[PDB]
Amino acid sequence: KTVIKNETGTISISQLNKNVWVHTELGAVPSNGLVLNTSKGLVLVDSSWDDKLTKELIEMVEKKFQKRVTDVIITHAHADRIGGIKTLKERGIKAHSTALTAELAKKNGYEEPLGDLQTVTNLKFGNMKVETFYPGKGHTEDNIVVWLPQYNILVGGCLVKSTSAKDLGNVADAYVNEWSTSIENVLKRYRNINAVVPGHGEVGDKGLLLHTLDLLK
Ligand SMILES: O=C(O)/C(S)=C/c1ccc(F)cc1
């Protein structure tokens, strides 16, 4: 498991496979996203808590992989996901989201992502296939998951709790009666999962989805 850290230790990238890395930043509260190394540029799943960390993350991966960050997929409109949106927009990085996530971003005072993702959207960056899926309300009204069909890797985002999470966390924006159905929708769509990246904590497998179901009881 190859891990690479910034000079301060607040940003780390860990390799899942040749072209897929998890990025983790400390805001201490760690948060995860993905880095996809594609033939057409780097694509991130999620930014980071604020613009300072987002700039550092972009600069680390551009230097390491020797290509530009071209696109980011924003999985919901909380700061751990979208806090670096100002940095993305001013650098000409495309910030993909559902329309609901964009609406919520604007309501909460953040610059707006594109609002281009539908309930199911299939993107392709070079040879890298990316599917985004809105499974329903859960951790937030707008949360989406991201699927890499060439690897059967699911980015659960904050809809999915890690093994170390012993409760649901802050549920102020959550829908705890719909969250279980939303997880079941993920389990029904993706029946063979190799790795599940939660929004916070260690990478796991389908067991993290079952763990989240148990925390909802
Ligand atoms: O638990 C999490 O994954 C998150 S991202 C919680 C959260 C953050 C900001 C809020 F306003 C509400 C909840």
Ligand SMILES: [Zn+2]
């Ligand atoms: Zn959140």
Ligand SMILES: [Zn+2]
């Ligand atoms: Zn979160």
